[PDB]
Design a protein around this ligand. Structure first.
Ligand code: U02
Lengths: 99, 99
């Protein structure tokens, strides 16, 4: 995959045996998913976007397959507008910005 | 350039005479720059992100030099915490996201 930005960089992620859609976001440091049920213990987090801060739950060493690419790492679950794959997951699947 | 996302994807941009640092961010449909002065007329607008919505003043057909390359298009000016170059000019500079 080589993706252009004429349209939202949307992918299908598989987390929990579920297909969800997420935006590829390079502006995003962490991966933020909408509310859902993940395994294990969480910690608390406050990330700040364009509209202010939200507080999320941090989950570690979570398995997420993103466009058939398997990443394992930190996911943050909270009141976001959409599912964001951040730079934290972009680098594990070998993502590059190019121009 | 091929850029890696281990570090935040920051670029220097030249807009309305001034050099600024902005974040290349493919999660953003629109380029939103922190409060500055743009010549011409502007239409009020509210765009959301993580955190909620912010009020912006949309100037149209602003010329900008992101890493040398000149893009034309709409810049919004508001209390964005960081200057954000979104999909609307990225495309213009032949930015692609590859993995
Ligand atoms: C600036 C960093 C922060 C996210 C972050 C920061 C630190 C660590 C992790 C994540 C951040 C990045 C991002 O790309 C966004 C995104 C964003 C950024 C700039 C502008 C917009 N709005 C637009 O482009 C126009 C309207 N789009 C829109 O409403 O989209 C949604 C998804 C809300 C429906 C939206 C957001 C939609 C997800 C943001 O809100 O906040």
């Amino acid at each position: 995959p080589q993706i252009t930005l004429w349209q939202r960089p949307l992918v299908t992620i598989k987390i929990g045996g579920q297909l969800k859609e997420a935006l590829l976001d390079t502006g995003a440091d962490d991966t933020v998913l909408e509310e859902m049920s993940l395994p294990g213990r969480w910690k608390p987090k406050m990330i700040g976007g364009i509209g202010g801060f939200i507080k999320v739950r941090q989950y570690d060493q979570i398995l997420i397959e993103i466009c058939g690419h398997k990443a394992i790492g930190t996911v943050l679950v909270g009141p976001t507008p959409v599912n964001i794959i951040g730079r934290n997951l972009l680098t594990q699947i070998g993502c590059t910005l190019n121009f």
